[PDB]
Symmetry: none
């Protein structure tokens, strides 16, 4: 069971990537895929297409973000209880749509 995560530009700009990652790896999850992308207007619209909103697109494109896929025994529940400032999948099959939006299988690295 794998979940999805997004580090908003507030934490990336304030240099908080290590704290967010360290608070997870100590909780049991494992970063099995990650990359830093700077979303565009069309990119942020596609991931947030279930709204159609405008002020949210401007903030998510105001700087680079840290996208990552997390693995672990029961992650959707463990992740949501760990943590706005950070994104996280609410239910399964919602993580599958968000993971496939940013990650092909060739970019996912099982341990």
């Amino acid at each position: 069971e794998r979940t999805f995560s997004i580090i908003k530009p507030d934490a990336v700009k304030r240099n908080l990537i290590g704290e967010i990652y360290h608070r997870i790896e100590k909780a049991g999850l494992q970063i099995i895929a990650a990359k830093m992308v700077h979303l565009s207007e069309e990119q942020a619209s596609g991931f947030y297409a279930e709204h159609e909103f405008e002020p949210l697109k401007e903030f998510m494109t105001s700087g680079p973000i840290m996208v990552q896929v997390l693995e672990g025994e029961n992650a959707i529940a463990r992740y949501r209880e760990l943590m706005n400032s950070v994104h996280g999948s609410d239910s399964p099959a919602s993580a599958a749509r968000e993971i496939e939006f940013f990650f092909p299988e060739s970019e996912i690295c099982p341990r």
Copy 2:
């Protein structure tokens, strides 16, 4: 607007990724003034590890060095900041270390262009 701005390359070897130390290493880098402007997790292969470490083909330790960097996923980043070459080198102290870092600007330029195209480097502003 200092001209001491420079970027350095960094790799978190599979032993630290398998042990889940990615966050602990990132925190030590960020706490030293450096900033991650480009990063991704990749799993090297025989073909890719041979190209990066191609300067050590004739050495009798190539076949294992290639075999260590392909035993698990790694984490490669581009660290930016004032005197980032020396600052990041001082963080780890100075072949099979816990982390990788560039030792010179020409080495940093050649090693960044191997893993990251310019379209994957994200300026902070």
Copy 3:
């Protein structure tokens, strides 16, 4: 002499104040029949932003919500008119919006008394 008279509270968040959109937002409010009977520009603090949004202390998004409303000066106003609650809500469409507005009379009463005393409300006649 309609009894549909009511007042609503409004905040222009620092992103719109820093971008110099105060006049553009005022014009859209005035062109919809509403009138500004009380207004002032303040710069919130950790202590003041915590009191206004005190209903969201346990939520994990409090610390940043407090940090956004204190990153720059804001503009707080009292808009008056017939059905001003729904008219102003319809202007913006319906947490981190371009502008703030009351959603109910009890919310408008509690939010006006936090920023404006009665001695700062100016009736139009």
Copy 4:
């Protein structure tokens, strides 16, 4: 260099606050302090004490006004050329006396 401004009760009553503010922010100035006050007989007399007149006090107290402080590179000249119906400082040190009459430093918000 900051200047001073007063929106007379004619524009406030006619709902012209947005037009006056929009015509300024598009000109380069920035509203760094503002509040709506209803002047009294003693208030209007103090701000207009350099006369001592009577019909002017009655008009400036016949309704609420919009006081504001404006900031920008060379504002006294830029403001006077933008614009009776609206007040504005004529020279520097005349804005300092008018700003201090309505605004303590605790009410002025630099960006």
